[PDB]
């Protein structure tokens with residue numbers, strides 16, 4: 472068995488190996504990469520996503536989200552308070568202001584210590600979930616707006632043609648902006664490219680151990696757990712590495728820098744934070760190996776998780792028993 476300790480693997484494809492996206496994912500899996508739940512891919516030195524980032528300031532962040540925490544430093548939830556629209560230039564200036572800017576620090580480890588000690592006492596503003604792309608149309612390799620669609624993968628594997636579309640999303644971050652513990656919708660893969668700015672630290676639980684994290688979360692968030700049998704789908708709960716270690720939960724961590732891709736694998740729980748002003752692009756995707764995970768994925772039917780148009784068909788075809796209840800949740 473390849474990668475039996477479920478370590479995060481880092482890959483350095485050549486420009487020739489960067490041509491065929493599906494083939495390289497399958498290669499990484501042949502080496503055991505999926506067992507960690509997360510892999511890093513450093514593009515060949517010849518590649519670029521676009522020529523420059525000098526002209527992005529006029530992108531609108533229609534609904535910036537203020538991430539307000541409740542709980543204790545290592546075990547907390549966040550809610551998203553909607554703020555007035557602002558441009559990416561306005562948001563960058565806000566991220567760099569004395570109130571929001573990254574503090575002085577020694578290295579990534581010191582900054583991580585400071586994040587876990589102090590996150591809850593601040594409410595950073597995240598420009599998350601913005602439909603769009605920063606890849607140049609002429610970038611032919613690993614262009615997240617030109618991937619094969621999940622609807623096409625389902626049709627190729629299973630024969631059934633379904634409605635829906637699959638497009639990327641931009642994330643503009645600042646110091647302490649946070650992504651809560653989650654897997655993807657329908658336990659899909661995700662791919663995330665850090666276009667510019669400061670790093671993003673990730674935490675991940677191996678897919679084979681995801682239920683260990685769920686059982687801890689039910690213990691740590693007992694009211695949420697009674698409200699919903701899949702409340703991590705709400706994407707609100709944070710648990711620190713120290714708390715994970717105290718409770719014996721297997722996990723790994725890694726920091727992504729500008730110019731690097733991360734892939735999350737089906738049922739790989741992940742969480743993390745931004746070091747300072749940055750911009751990432753991410754999209755979900757599927758492979759043949761995903762289908763079985765999609766058929767078994769949990770679902771939120773309490774009404775909180777509320778998701779995309781395209782998830783309807785995935786539930787309807789892969790989980791017809793659950794369909795009726797799930798759709799009541801969505802309506």
Ligand SMILES: O=C(O)CNC(=O)C(=O)O
Nearest residue numbers: 642650661663735751753
């Ligand atoms: O970057 C973020 O805030 C969150 N991203 C993801 O969860 C992902 O790419 O799967």
Ligand SMILES: [Mg+2]
Nearest residue numbers: 527528529530
């Ligand atoms: Mg612009």
Ligand code: NI
Nearest residue numbers: 654655661741
């Ligand atoms: Ni994710």
Ligand SMILES: [Zn+2]
Nearest residue numbers: 699771773775
């Ligand atoms: Zn729910």
